Design a protein around this nucleic acid. Structure first.
Lengths: 207, 71, 129, 118, 104, 223, 83
RNA sequence: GAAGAUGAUUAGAGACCAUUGUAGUCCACACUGCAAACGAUGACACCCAUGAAUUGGGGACUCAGCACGUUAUCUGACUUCUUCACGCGAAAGCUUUGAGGUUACAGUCUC
């Protein structure tokens, strides 16, 4: 950003977590528009995402949700179990609205409907199957931020965070980092301590 | 399409002169077979001597009898 | 082949502009193509351009600021005159306000606006909005 | 044979608001249905009664399509609070992490550099 | 008129051949181009299961002794031919474009 | 009318004095989803509502056939706001009432420039524009002052609405299907602001949306 | 800025917004032309308040050129770090 | 196997079907130039994005310092996205392989 003291920069323990829970990898298939994000290819054929790139995307999306002073106008959406849990725990803290399970059409466009809402901003776990959401963000003038599989298209995604959406431990990490840093910039939790509660709360468990 | 060259002129001219013969709104003016065919000679009117009164039918959707004159 | 140098250049610019691209490549170079670019860069429609040398024929490269909407070519190079500035300026352009037709003269290469000023007509070259 | 959506709707609502109804006995569930409801049909009340039995008999397995208020408890059955646990284990106290040589090459060229146990 | 099929019911692409050899039918003797013609591969048994048992009883050097051979053939059919024995059928728009390649 | 309850952010603001003009809504692109947003901001004695067409449509059914009526509305201010509805209803009055709603949603502003003579306030379109619906496409050409509205009576209306008093025009293709001609002409008059001109550019500053600024009072609104 | 008279007086209803990426006029008609507002940050993680703004056109979400352009815009203003 | 012959089918039937059968079907040397000779898309040239393959060449003892395959790149051909981008078209459809870059109408030639 600047002027600034190298603030909100990747660190030892940050990296240590990401590598471990395997969100540094992508999906195996080569991209259709995310070619730049990919850093090489392994001898398992899985495309590694660059760490520096991902990190800056995350800080960016923090600046977005920091600029909404009524967090309830931002939406979170999953259609996948692995992100389901992490949504609920996030909407407690950051105070965002959400719909999870499945997106329902006409929640952002159909007037006669009691599930009607007008977001300022929208998030998604996967732009591929949350797609209905995105196409109703388009016509209401709502920007988007998504957690993009490398394979995934970027259609109707304004800003994109490269991600692995396969498995629980991948997705939980990303929501946890966002939520952390967001609360560090609003309500001023210091970055001096390690953050208060665990990533294990954001893991899907089954009831 | 067409030719945009500087000296292309003669090809354009000869093209038009050919394709106006595919117009019937050119023939009707310039050709004197049309004039000949017309029973007035292309004049506004003409006079004639009445021969016989001829009753003439009508086409299928409107059935009527029409009064006509063989001149 | 190509029978107009200008046509080869300014169909790369137009297409690129409609895709919003911020640089374009141009396959040939001529003394003429230079002058055309120069005009538009003064009036503010182009950032910069480079001419690169292969020592056979150069490859121009241009930086678009996205301020153009079209750059055409009037191919037969028809004769325009001191009265007939009016004619062209109406017929091929969307306006008289910001339409720029570019012409050739003995004097050099210039806008219609400057052509009228020095009172010389000539053969037309290209146009832009 | 097949029952209507009026039946199934009303019976679902009942099983959410009442756990007085809990039986597989037609007879008990009938008498508590009819007194709590105004529906003014014998048919609808007997249907609804038999549906509430059908619900409970299926709940003996577990999965139903019914509606219950049991969801309250099933939600806070999720206790994921453990002292590090999976968090710092994965970060390796000495538990180890090993990963591709491309990953290695990336890490050491970062400003952060490699973290320990990798 | 209207381009009902892009490939025109052929495995022949535009601007390559424009001529592929005719091939007879094993039904009606009709000729059509090879690419148009409707290929199938049969793998026809020489005994029903019911009879296979009975013959394998009387066998010693065969059946149990060696697995029974089958008659293999390629069958190239006409369009009309195929449709009438209902081994090819009309499909909705979305499905007509699908192919399964040369695999079964 | 009957008492009105906004379900739209915009709607709330408009019912208050917060958004006081169309311009604010337009300038930071936002859809108008309630026709009541137009009526409140732009007072009656500026608005006009004409019915450009009413026609029967028929849908085939075994034995007797059901019928319906298509109709168009056109709407706007002579100060440079226009908007064209079209809708369908099974009776006359239905489709009429419906049209006027849709019309007031579809409202779009109009840029008017000059021909190269500057006096008074704009009398002329700023440039040539085209619009196309079906095979018809219209070419609006800017005219000198005192030209009048040189077009057919169908577009003459549509141009009068948009504050254009000096124009020269021609159409192409099949123009004798009325409906297509209307939509065409309207898409033309949009395309003005869709075209970049030197006079406009200066890297003009943006500022916060009315929605964002007023977020607090929308929260209070929800309560 | 905008059309003027010979008297220098503005005649326009409004002057439309700029899309910084392509330098093209954002229409009222385009509702996919989103205004993204990021909140700046200083040392000690304190928000300066919303200051900077981007505007993206609706012709950049019809093929998703959006992400690409946002980066070039950001990186130039020092918001996003590159090595 | 046209023509012809015979038997059926049928109210009538060289019919469609069945059994036959001449010209023809083949080759050489002459003519004919009449096809849905179609991609119903004239020829040359420029610009134009998404993914996975195939076909040739090139790049990183004994017909043998060889042949094949994989990774990656390139030039030349044929085409698919049954997730082809922009755009065009009345629509069906067309998409570096144009019917796109065209009322903001002009690269060149021809029928």
């Amino acid at each position: 950003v600047e002027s600034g003291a190298k603030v909100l920069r990747m660190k030892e323990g940050d990296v240590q977590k990401l590598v471990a829970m395997h969100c540094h990898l992508g999906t195996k298939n080569r991209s259709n528009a995310m070619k730049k994000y990919i850093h090489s290819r392994t001898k398992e054929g899985t495309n590694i995402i660059d760490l520096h790139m991902t990190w800056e995307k995350l800080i960016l999306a923090a600046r977005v949700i920091a600029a909404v002073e009524n967090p309830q106008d931002v939406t979170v959406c999953s259609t996948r179990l692995f992100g389901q849990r992490a949504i609920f725990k996030f909407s407690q803290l950051v105070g965002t609205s959400f719909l999870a399970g499945r997106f329902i059409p006409g929640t952002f466009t159909n007037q006669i409907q009691k599930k009607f809402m007008q977001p300022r901003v929208l998030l998604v776990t996967d732009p591929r199957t949350d797609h209905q959401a995105l196409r109703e963000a388009s016509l209401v003038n709502i920007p988007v931020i998504a957690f993009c599989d490398t394979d995934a298209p970027l259609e109707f995604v304004d800003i994109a965070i490269p991600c692995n959406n396969r498995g629980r431990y991948s997705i939980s990490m990303m929501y946890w980092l966002l939520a952390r840093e967001v609360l560090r910039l609003r309500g001023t939790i210091p970055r001096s301590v390690p953050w208060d509660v665990k990533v294990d709360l954001f893991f899907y468990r089954d009831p | 399409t067409k030719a945009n060259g500087q000296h292309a002129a003669r090809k354009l001219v000869r093209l038009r002169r050919k394709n106006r013969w595919a117009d019937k709104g050119w023939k009707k003016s310039h050709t004197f077979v049309a004039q000949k065919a017309n029973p007035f000679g292309g004049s506004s009117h003409a006079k004639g001597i009445v021969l016989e009164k001829i009753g003439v039918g009508a086409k299928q959707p409107n059935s009527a009898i029409r009064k006509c004159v063989r001149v | 082949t190509m029978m107009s140098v200008l046509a080869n250049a300014l169909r790369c610019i137009a297409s690129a502009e409609r895709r919003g691209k911020r640089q374009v490549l141009i396959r040939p170079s001529s003394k003429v193509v230079v002058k055309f670019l120069q005009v538009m860069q003064k009036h503010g429609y182009i950032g910069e351009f480079e001419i690169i040398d292969d020592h056979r024929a150069g490859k121009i490269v241009v930086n678009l600021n996205g301020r153009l909407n079209k750059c055409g070519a009037i191919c037969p190079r028809f004769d325009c005159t001191t009265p007939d500035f009016e004619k062209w300026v109406k017929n091929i352009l969307p306006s008289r306000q910001f339409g720029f037709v570019v012409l050739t003269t003995s004097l050099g290469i210039m806008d219609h606006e400057e052509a009228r000023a020095r009172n010389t007509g000539g053969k037309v070259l290209g146009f832009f909005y | 044979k097949i029952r209507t959506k009026t039946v199934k709707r009303a019976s679902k609502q009942l099983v959410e608001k009442y756990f007085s109804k809990l039986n597989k006995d037609f007879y008990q569930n009938k008498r508590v249905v009819m007194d709590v409801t105004i529906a003014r049909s014998k048919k609808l009340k007997n249907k609804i009664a038999g549906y509430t039995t059908h619900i409970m008999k299926r709940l003996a397995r577990g999965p139903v399509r019914g509606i219950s208020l049991k969801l309250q408890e099933e939600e806070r059955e999720r206790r994921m609070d453990y002292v590090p646990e999976v968090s710092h284990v994965d970060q390796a106290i000495q538990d180890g992490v090993h990963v591709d040589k491309q990953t290695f090459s990336m890490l050491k060229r970062m400003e952060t550099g490699v973290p320990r146990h990798v | 008129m209207t381009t009902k099929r892009r490939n025109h019911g052929r495995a022949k692409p535009p601007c390559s051949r424009g001529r592929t050899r005719p091939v007879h039918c094993f039904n009606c003797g009709r000729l059509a181009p090879k690419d148009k013609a409707v290929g199938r591969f049969v793998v026809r048994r020489m005994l029903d299961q019911a009879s296979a048992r009975d013959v394998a009883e009387a066998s010693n050097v065969y059946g149990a002794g060696f697995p029974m051979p089958k008659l293999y053939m390629k069958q190239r059919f006409c369009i009309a031919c195929a449709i009438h024995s209902r081994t090819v059928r009309a499909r909705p728009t979305d499905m007509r474009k699908r192919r399964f390649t040369t695999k079964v | 009318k009957e008492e009105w309850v906004p379900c739209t952010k915009l709607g709330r603001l408009v019912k208050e004095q917060k958004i006081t003009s169309l311009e604010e809504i337009f300038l930071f692109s936002m859809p108008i989803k309630e026709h009541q947003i137009v009526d409140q901001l732009i007072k009656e004695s500026d608005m006009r509502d004409e019915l450009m067409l009413i026609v029967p449509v028929q849908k085939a059914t075994s034995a007797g056939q059901r019928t319906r009526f298509k109709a168009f509305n056109i709407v706007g201010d002579g100060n440079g706001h226009i908007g064209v509805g079209a809708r369908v209803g099974k009776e006359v009055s239905l489709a009429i009432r419906a049209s006027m709603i849709a019309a007031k949603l579809n409202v779009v502003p109009i840029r008017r420039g000059y021909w190269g003579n500057k006096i008074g306030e704009p009398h002329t379109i700023p440039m040539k524009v085209t619009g196309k619906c079906g095979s018809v496409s219209v070419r609006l050409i800017p005219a000198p002052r005192g030209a009048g509205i040189v077009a057919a009576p169908v577009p003459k209306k549509i141009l009068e609405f948009a504050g254009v008093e000096d124009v020269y025009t021609s159409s192409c293709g099949n123009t004798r299907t009325r409906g297509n001609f209307i939509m065409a002409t309207f898409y033309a008059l949009r395309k003005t602001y869709g075209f970049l001109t030197p006079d406009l550019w200066a890297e003009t500053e943006v500022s916060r949306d009315p929605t964002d600024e007023h977020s607090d009072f929308l929260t209070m609104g929800s309560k | 800025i905008g059309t003027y008279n010979e008297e220098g007086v503005n005649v326009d209803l409004y002057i439309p917004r700029k899309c910084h990426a392509t330098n093209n006029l954002i229409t009222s008609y385009d509702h996919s032309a989103v205004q993204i507002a990021i909140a700046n940050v200083d040392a000690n993680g304190v928000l300066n308040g919303t200051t900077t703004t981007f505007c993206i056109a609706g012709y950049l979400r019809r093929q998703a050129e959006s992400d690409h352009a946002i980066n070039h815009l950001a990186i130039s203003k020092g918001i996003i770090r590159i090595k």
